[PDB]
DNA sequence: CGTTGCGGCAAAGTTATGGGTAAAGTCACACGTAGTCACCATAATGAAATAAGATCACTACTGGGCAGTACCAGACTCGAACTGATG
């Protein structure tokens, strides 16, 4: 979806500290972080072009 | 030789020049000589003015950082429970 959420939003929704997820599932968490960062970078790029 | 003209000699005669002495002239004392523009250069300010300087205001150009976001673990601390020695 839009602004794929970040680590903070996912952790707040799950009610767990970020280290709790981070100590067991690094690959998928890095996948979510990369997706969010890529969406932000793409949106910034379109904003730069349009501006 | 007796007479006549000529020339030397030495007073004598005539001018000239620098002195002295009485005596006819001469002239200032009469309130009065200093006094007054004209002249152009130099100091010397005081004003006129400076030529640059000082600051305001505006216009445009270009460095460039801060509040905030985000992840990936490592490491200490400790609920909660397990398990062994004991009086």
Q: What percentage of chain A's residues is helix, strand, coil (to nearest 5)?
A: 75, 0, 25
Contacts of A5 (CB under 8 A, 6+ apart): A13, A32, A36
What determination technique applies here? cryo-EM
Burial of A38: CB neighbours in 10 Å, binned 0-12, 13-18, 19+? exposed
Q: Which secondary-structure segment (H or E) carries A3? A: none
From CA A29, how far away is CA A21, in angstroms rounded?
8
User: For residue A9, which nucleotide's C1' is closest to its Cα?
Assistant: B70
Nearest to A9 by CA among A41, A38, A23, A18: A18
From CA A33, how far away is CA A16, in angstroms rounded?
17
From CA A46, how far away is CA A12, in angstroms rounded?
30
Task: Check if residue A38 sits with its Cβ under 7 angstroms from strand B.
Answer: no
């Amino acid at each position: 979806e839009e602004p794929p959420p970040t680590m903070e939003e996912v952790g707040k929704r799950l009610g767990h500290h970020n280290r709790t997820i981070s100590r067991h599932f690094p690959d998928l968490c890095s996948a979510i972080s990369a997706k969010c960062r890529n969406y932000n970078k793409a949106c910034r790029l379109k904003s730069i072009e349009k501006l």
